[PDB]
Design a binder for this molecule. Structure first.
Ligand code: CO
Ligand code: CO
Lengths: 269, 268
């Protein structure tokens, strides 16, 4: 298992200097604390100079392990299940641009809020539309790997549990799509988290950690011990990525506390 | 990767019933033999009915993966690099109509002979005109995807190799334009076909196969083994479309032989 840090970055459209500054500050923090990779989130990759990002990654010996896409939904309204097929097509085209960046870094592409919500429709129709969009994404890409993140009920009514996502993976039937499980979301939505992770098994491709209050792991009441016992049991050997609020004490303090909590869980494995 | 068959069809403006007959028999053949899709070529899409084509595709469970445009040049003289701006405009407008049809099927639009020739001009002037026409097509269409097919020296003096297409793709700077490589044309124009395909990489969007004599794959001396090894190595998961003369033995026998040859190289 490896440790990664999710870094917040300003959008670059807008403010190129702020994006670059945020990115460097976050990557230097991750490296100093001891993280082995970083994870980022960008709304539209077409407005970023990825050649400079690559140089930064090389300078710091810090890979980018995953790229989040949710701002494409929250800011730009793009959804892979949008009832308007024109917007569905634009969402697919946006995510293809994320996969072009991911290919430079060997990064996973996260399918979170960009999948969209039920919007008054049956779960069945929403799921069918989503599977069609994902199959299109697989037809459009040769190397990209995607991970579906179940999110809690307040963020979406479409794919709330690991089981929801596993059903969809069976229909998509591609090893280029897996699951991203997130402890903050699972703390609400999963009955028994160790059992849920066992059901995921080999399909667990990426992992987000934050405590019950979404603070740094260690600063709420989430049982990480049972989770890491299970991760060892299912042979999970990919990234554990810290995706938490900058609490307590700011982004640097949170990243350090999280690292210490997780390192102790992992070394006693 | 997936196998498709190019099927020849009569011009609908001349014989509407013949086009349907041809399309149906071609699609029935493709399904019978085991192809996963068909590819077609039409001079002028505006005078065909495509809703009936779609239900035919639906009832045979047979997608249309690509639409050829070359007859717009050969029959109607339309070229995306025509020196006459009025004719160049009409060529652009014709190809926009092809993209509307392609959109119904999620198909690629092929830019082959419709790009036109140098006609006495520098390569550079011809190229810049082409890039302008392609950028105009990208502005006039929102989701259409185009593939440029390098053709051999006897068919054109403009874009003969994969490397020349790649250079032009960089100048257009859109993922909505890629390359269609054709083994018959590459057999003449490419130094080393596996190396050319690796350079194309992810920009190889579509693939035409025919043997060295343009007969069914298996009936000449083209090395398909090294090609398919390379396609596997680069992770090609798009279409391989049989575009060959109806030889040996006619359209159906050629389609059968091609499928048998290619399926085996795809099997392993
Ligand atoms: Co998460
Ligand atoms: Co061809």
């Amino acid at each position: 298992m490896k440790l990664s840090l999710v870094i917040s970055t300003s959008d670059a459209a807008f403010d190129a200097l702020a994006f670059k500054g945020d990115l460097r500050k976050g990557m230097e923090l991750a490296k100093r604390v001891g993280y082995q990779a970083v994870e980022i989130a960008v709304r539209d990759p077409s407005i970023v100079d990825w050649n400079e990002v690559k140089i930064l990654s090389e300078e710091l010996n810090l890979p980018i392990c995953a790229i989040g896409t949710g701002q494409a939904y929250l800011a730009d309204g793009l959804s892979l299940t949008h009832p308007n097929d024109e917007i569905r097509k634009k969402a697919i085209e946006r995510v293809v641009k994320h996969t072009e960046v991911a290919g430079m870094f060997g990064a996973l592409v996260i399918i979170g809020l960009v999948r969209g919500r039920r919007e008054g429709r049956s779960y069945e129709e929403t799921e069918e539309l989503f599977i069609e969009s994902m199959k299109r994404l697989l037809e459009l890409t040769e190397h990209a790997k995607f991970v579906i993140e179940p999110l809690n009920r307040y963020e979406t009514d479409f794919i709330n549990t690991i089981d929801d996502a596993l059903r969809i993976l069976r229909k998509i039937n591609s090893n280029r799509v897996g699951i991203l499980a997130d402890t903050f979301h699972m703390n609400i939505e999963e009955v028994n988290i160790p059992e849920s992770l066992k059901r995921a098994g080999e399909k667990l491709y990426h992992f987000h950690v934050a405590d019950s209050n979404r603070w740094a792991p260690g600063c709420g009441h989430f049982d990480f011990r049972s989770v890491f016992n299970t991760l060892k049991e299912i042979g999970y050997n990919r990234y554990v990525s810290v995706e938490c609020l900058p609490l307590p004490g700011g982004m640097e303090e949170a990243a350090e506390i999280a690292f210490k909590t997780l390192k102790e869980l992992i070394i006693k494995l």
